[PDB]
Design a protein around this ligand. Structure first.
Ligand SMILES: CC(C)CC(CC(C)C)NC(=O)[C@@H]1CNC[C@H](N2CC(=O)N(c3ccccc3Cl)CC2(C)C)C1
Ligand SMILES: *[C@@H]1O[C@H](CO)[C@@H](O)[C@H](O)[C@H]1NC(C)=O
Length: 336
């Protein structure tokens, strides 16, 4: 592990409080793409120009064209990323990727098959996994690992900051953290094991009456997830306590009832991380004649990683998050 002095930052744009993306450039000359940085995965991919135009999502996004890059390096082995909410498929390619000022040769997948649902709903073009190589599909070295191999980063860590206003939309600091966006001290929790940004969660409290995860649970700290999620079983009890009713994909409460929802706390490493209704309710109205969505979904992640809760933007918006790769821990601090 070689440590330099360079720390870099990627300015993120906030889309509806659900999607936080930044720009990266691939090839020579650079072909820019909008991508989300997902600690819940380890691969990098952008839509390919070789993607059949019958995939409308490809018609509605920036396509990487290898024929215009002089740095491109062919490989072609097939690749399929099966995410929780959808799947993408294509092949592996190599070229120079610029991110936050750093130029690194990277193996990424050129997606040639990306379904309308959910990708048509995607503001971003691709994804940059910030997970360990252990979670990488196709055994492809993660872009951060490669950057660390350059020995330019001052620290073997990166931090995320998600702003509330959908000003700066968000900010990722590679090689450290930005004290401008957090106050108080960082409080760390150790990873259940290296290879996954998952930590032990001692318990989830809702208001004063209910207590979920009383025997412990797993908490994946997911920068690529918009909401906070728990096993269907957990969310049912949780939502029961909130008085919310379940629709096809999310939960909602009559907007007038929104402001009076109880607090929800997540016990992590001996520190109570609390959210208020304003933290998880999309309060777009106060009338009883309208339904307000909750930023908490139900999602059952399969073993070996699941069952587990997922702490996404809903959580990260309030708590500045630092991902420490050298000490295999995650640190939280109050965002500002
Ligand atoms: C469950 C984990 C541990 C593994 C799994 C897959 C693995 C092969 C990495 N990881 C994930 O699924 C990722 C977990 N973190 C979130 C991530 N998002 C899913 C999603 O719904 N996205 C999205 C957001 C808004 C609009 C449209 C879309 Cl597509 C984008 C990404 C892919 C970043 C998938
Ligand atoms: C793709 O890269 C792998 C190494 O990661 C290599 O073994 C393989 O031959 C490459 N694909 C080809 C045939 O270009």
């Amino acid at each position: 592990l070689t440590l330099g002095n360079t720390t870099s930052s990627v300015i993120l744009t906030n889309y509806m409080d659900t999607q936080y993306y930044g720009e990266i450039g691939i090839g020579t000359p650079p072909q820019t793409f909008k991508v989300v940085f997902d600690t819940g995965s380890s691969n990098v991919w952008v839509p390919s120009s070789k993607c059949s135009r019958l995939y409308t999502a490809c018609v509605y996004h920036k396509l990487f064209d290898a024929s215009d890059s002089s740095s491109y390096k062919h490989n072609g082995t097939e690749l399929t990323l099966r995410y929780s909410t959808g799947t993408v498929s294509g092949f592996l390619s190599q070229d120079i990727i610029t991110v936050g000022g750093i130029t690194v040769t990277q193996m990424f997948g050129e997606v040639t098959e990306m379904p309308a649902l959910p990708f048509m709903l995607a503001e971003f073009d691709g994804v940059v996994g910030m997970g360990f190589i252990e979670q990488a599909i196709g055994r492809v070295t993660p872009i951060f690992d490669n950057i660390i191999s350059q020995g330019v980063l001052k620290e073997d860590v990166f931090s995320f900051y998600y702003n509330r206003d959908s000003s700066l939309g968000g900010q990722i600091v590679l090689g450290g953290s930005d004290p401008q966006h957090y106050e108080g001290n960082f409080h760390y929790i150790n990873l259940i094991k290296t290879g996954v940004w998952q930590i032990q969660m001692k318990g989830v409290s809702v208001g004063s009456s209910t207590l979920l995860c009383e025997d412990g649970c797993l908490a994946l700290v997911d920068t690529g997830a918009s909401y906070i999620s728990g096993s269907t079983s957990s969310i049912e009890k949780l939502m029961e306590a909130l008085g919310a009713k379940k629709r096809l994909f999310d939960y909602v409460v009559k907007c007038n009832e929104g402001p009076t929802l109880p607090d929800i706390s997540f016990h992590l490493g001996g520190k109570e991380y609390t959210l208020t209704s304003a933290d998880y309710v999309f309060q777009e109205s106060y009338s009883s004649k309208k339904l307000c969505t909750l930023a908490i979904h139900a999602m059952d992640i399969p073993p070996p990683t699941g069952p587990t809760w997922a702490l996404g933007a809903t959580f990260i918006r309030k708590f500045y998050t630092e991902f420490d790769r050298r000490n295999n821990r995650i640190g939280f601090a109050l965002a500002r």
